[PDB]
Design a protein around this ligand. Sequence first.
Ligand SMILES: *[C@@H]1O[C@H](CO)[C@@H](O[C@@H]2O[C@H](CO)[C@@H](O)[C@H](O)[C@H]2NC(C)=O)[C@H](O)[C@H]1NC(C)=O
Ligand SMILES: *[C@@H]1O[C@H](CO)[C@@H](O[C@@H]2O[C@H](CO)[C@@H](O)[C@H](O)[C@H]2NC(C)=O)[C@H](O)[C@H]1NC(C)=O
Ligand SMILES: *[C@@H]1O[C@H](CO)[C@@H](O[C@@H]2O[C@H](CO)[C@@H](O)[C@H](O)[C@H]2NC(C)=O)[C@H](O)[C@H]1NC(C)=O
Ligand SMILES: *[C@@H]1O[C@H](CO)[C@@H](O[C@@H]2O[C@H](CO)[C@@H](O)[C@H](O)[C@H]2NC(C)=O)[C@H](O)[C@H]1NC(C)=O
Ligand SMILES: *[C@@H]1O[C@H](CO)[C@@H](O)[C@H](O)[C@H]1NC(C)=O
Ligand SMILES: *[C@@H]1O[C@H](CO)[C@@H](O)[C@H](O)[C@H]1NC(C)=O
Ligand SMILES: *[C@@H]1O[C@H](CO)[C@@H](O)[C@H](O)[C@H]1NC(C)=O
Ligand SMILES: *[C@@H]1O[C@H](CO)[C@@H](O)[C@H](O)[C@H]1NC(C)=O
Ligand SMILES: *[C@@H]1O[C@H](CO)[C@@H](O)[C@H](O)[C@H]1NC(C)=O
Ligand SMILES: *[C@@H]1O[C@H](CO)[C@@H](O)[C@H](O)[C@H]1NC(C)=O
Ligand SMILES: *[C@@H]1O[C@H](CO)[C@@H](O)[C@H](O)[C@H]1NC(C)=O
Lengths: 167, 97, 112, 218, 48
Amino acid sequence: DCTMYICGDSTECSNLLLQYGSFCTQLNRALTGIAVEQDKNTQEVFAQVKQIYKTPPIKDFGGFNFSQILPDPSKPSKRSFIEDLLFNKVTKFNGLTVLPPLLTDEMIAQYTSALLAGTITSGWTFGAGAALQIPFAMQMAYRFNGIGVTQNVLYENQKLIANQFNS
Amino acid sequence: TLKSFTVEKGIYQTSNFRVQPTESIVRFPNITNLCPFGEVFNATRFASVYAWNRKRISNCVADYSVLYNSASFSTFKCYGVSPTKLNDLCFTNVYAD
Amino acid sequence: FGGVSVITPGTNTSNQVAVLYQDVNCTEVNVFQTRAGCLIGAEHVNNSYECDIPIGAGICASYQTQSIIAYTMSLGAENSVAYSNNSIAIPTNFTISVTTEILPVSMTKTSV
Amino acid sequence: AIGKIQDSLSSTASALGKLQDVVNQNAQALNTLVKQLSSNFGAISSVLNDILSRLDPPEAEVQIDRLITGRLQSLQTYVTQQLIRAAEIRASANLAATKMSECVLGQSKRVDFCGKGYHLMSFPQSAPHGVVFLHVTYVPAQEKNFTTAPAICHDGKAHFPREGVFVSNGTHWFVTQRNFYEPQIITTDNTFVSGNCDVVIGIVNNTVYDPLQPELDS
Amino acid sequence: ATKMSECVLGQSKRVDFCGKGYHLMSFPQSAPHGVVFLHVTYVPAQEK
Ligand SMILES: *[C@@H]1O[C@H](CO)[C@@H](O[C@@H]2O[C@H](CO)[C@@H](O)[C@H](O)[C@H]2NC(C)=O)[C@H](O)[C@H]1NC(C)=O
Ligand SMILES: *[C@@H]1O[C@H](CO)[C@@H](O[C@@H]2O[C@H](CO)[C@@H](O)[C@H](O)[C@H]2NC(C)=O)[C@H](O)[C@H]1NC(C)=O
Ligand SMILES: *[C@@H]1O[C@H](CO)[C@@H](O[C@@H]2O[C@H](CO)[C@@H](O)[C@H](O)[C@H]2NC(C)=O)[C@H](O)[C@H]1NC(C)=O
Ligand SMILES: *[C@@H]1O[C@H](CO)[C@@H](O[C@@H]2O[C@H](CO)[C@@H](O)[C@H](O)[C@H]2NC(C)=O)[C@H](O)[C@H]1NC(C)=O
Ligand SMILES: *[C@@H]1O[C@H](CO)[C@@H](O)[C@H](O)[C@H]1NC(C)=O
Ligand SMILES: *[C@@H]1O[C@H](CO)[C@@H](O)[C@H](O)[C@H]1NC(C)=O
Ligand SMILES: *[C@@H]1O[C@H](CO)[C@@H](O)[C@H](O)[C@H]1NC(C)=O
Ligand SMILES: *[C@@H]1O[C@H](CO)[C@@H](O)[C@H](O)[C@H]1NC(C)=O
Ligand SMILES: *[C@@H]1O[C@H](CO)[C@@H](O)[C@H](O)[C@H]1NC(C)=O
Ligand SMILES: *[C@@H]1O[C@H](CO)[C@@H](O)[C@H](O)[C@H]1NC(C)=O
Ligand SMILES: *[C@@H]1O[C@H](CO)[C@@H](O)[C@H](O)[C@H]1NC(C)=O
């Protein structure tokens, strides 16, 4: 608050700031646009998928383990062990306030869970359009063919690639 | 706040809610001693210019309206503080030359 | 003390307003308590809808049949995927869609 | 789709909200710069001619000094938001130029760079203080469930498709391109041989047609 | 946003856009005031 910061609880000080025009209004509007922008930037970086996708209870992904990135239902917040590791490593009366974000950590985790489930179960088809179910071995075969590697390499070394991915 | 007679759909911050006080609390230590300003102003003899006296005054209460209502003073210019808002304040130490 | 924000639709639609007191409890001030502050005048609805007027902490307000309502904003329609190790979903028909994208280019050449 | 674009642009006036917001921000900045002239900034009057007509130079200089101080602070503040707004305008112009160069003049394979869906081409349109792109995209519409297998045993050898994925309608197995259902007979001209059935996980048994065998028999 | 759009929702062929090596697919993860990506890349190891 520009008014409370410069002239909190002083009528004469408020009268003097009224003589300077709208410098107070300009700085509040500037912080209003910044506060809107932050939520906006969160919106384009996170809400790029229309539907909330959820992984099936069957984890037969060709040996690929995703329990470290997929959310754990036991926790009240739907977050992963890795996400908890990231969240654990990150650390008044003068008119200054902190506005809460529009999307808090729970729906942020839900958006990331939807993106992860859609990616794992559909490749790029959920982003291109409707989500098309694809086996994960076939999806990685498409990815390997996308970089000039024949799919026989994956279909002969699936166990080795799964072990290296888990490691 | 928007300086317009038409408001578009959305949220707008307009004012600041404040709780207004209703009770006035003025507290000072209840010293009943009369201040020796009268001895300083009404001394029989004053010292020299270079050997200017300095009276330290403590633990007293002074009203300062005696300095106002007396018209004998041909020079009264207070510099760092307003002398009219003096009885509502309290200070650590006061020195009278 | 706390900031005062007014949630309203367009004045063409209605003159009804909803008042949010920022970052304070509903003690000093149809009352809904949110993490963003104390909301007075807006009804609380269990059903989730798309966000129209954002408030904060997942709460969005809208003017629906009429009164001002408040709800937790929805993230979209839930759609599970029938994933299995031996099933494929392949398109059989397609549509050609045209989308509009607008980007600013030039700002007004003001000389002072 | 172009008719729907025309109808949407005729109906929704808020589709050009970015351009309207830029124009409104410029207008608000200019209006703020204009209205800051009415402020006294501690002077007895905000009118320069009134100060000059009322006061002698020894005090009028102090008054106009306060006036020009407030005015220069307001002016340099205005110039500050002018430079910042020009900075995101330059960023948006660079993004639009990159978009048009990679999207109109070519076929960008970047996902969601030219709108949702598989990108085919785009057409730019003139706009006041901006440019408008009409992204023509390929979006699938109707789908169906099919049984698939990563490889096929013909004589113990593992067959993989050269392009596409094996599909089955329940009784017969076909190979088709990835983004459209177009079933074809699985032949040696569509698949290649690599490895054997003992390595590939989830391999199945089918028959691969050889076009050379009827030609040799006939 | 560009990295997530062309790296999670697709397979980018841009070098060093999704980490060193041949990019295949990536995982987004939630973070306080940020987003963190797990880029799975293809790296050759043994040559002749
Ligand atoms: C994926 O890996 C995790 C470990 O990162 C496995 O979880 C462990 O499971 C074993 C039993 O199989 C437990 O004894 C460990 O205590 C678990 N550790 C953790 C951190 O949960 C998980 O089982 C693996 N899943 C698959 C499909 O292999
Ligand atoms: C694919 O979808 C299109 C529409 O998106 C279909 O075209 C329509 O077909 C019906 C026949 O059932 C006609 O009455 C309509 O006039 C067609 N629409 C247009 C715009 O021409 C098309 O038939 C579908 N094709 C398949 C193979 O399903
Ligand atoms: C799967 O597709 C094949 C196409 O090759 C179908 O086989 C044909 O079915 C029609 C329907 O009576 C017959 O007239 C043809 O003679 C069949 N051709 C061959 C080569 O068998 C088959 O019926 C389909 N199966 C299912 C379950 O849809
Ligand atoms: C494809 O057909 C072959 C037969 O040509 C199957 O091979 C049989 O495998 C079982 C299990 O190991 C053996 O008991 C049989 O003796 C094998 N047959 C012969 C003739 O040796 C093979 O399993 C089939 N593949 C699938 C996926 O069904
Ligand atoms: C000095 O004497 C006069 C006598 O009228 C008295 O009014 C005054 O209060 C005395 N001194 C002071 C300053 O207290
Ligand atoms: C007000 O809204 C109505 C539709 O309810 C519309 O037809 C009319 O043009 C609007 N008028 C204004 C002032 O925007
Ligand atoms: C509001 O005040 C009550 C007082 O009993 C307290 O129980 C409650 O937790 C407070 N809520 C908030 C939002 O601080
Ligand atoms: C939501 O429904 C529950 C019953 O399941 C009820 O107790 C609660 O008051 C409802 N809340 C609102 C805002 O309607
Ligand atoms: C595919 O099968 C699943 C089985 O649960 C079903 O829900 C889905 O609608 C089917 N999709 C099509 C296109 O047949
Ligand atoms: C798919 O998973 C099921 C387990 O439900 C298993 O019985 C089947 O053999 C698997 N098929 C392949 C091709 O991996
Ligand atoms: C290839 O040969 C050169 C010497 O000509 C040697 O220095 C290099 O290490 C060799 N690389 C491999 C992969 O054997």
